[PDB]
Amino acid sequence: QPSKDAFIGLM
């Protein structure tokens, strides 16, 4: 999902 991409920002 797109919300999962938000986790890519932190990483």
Side-chain angles (χ1 to χ4, degrees), residues 2-11:
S3 287
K4 226 98 132 152
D5 230 299
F7 232 70
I8 292 152
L10 324 204
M11 225 290 124

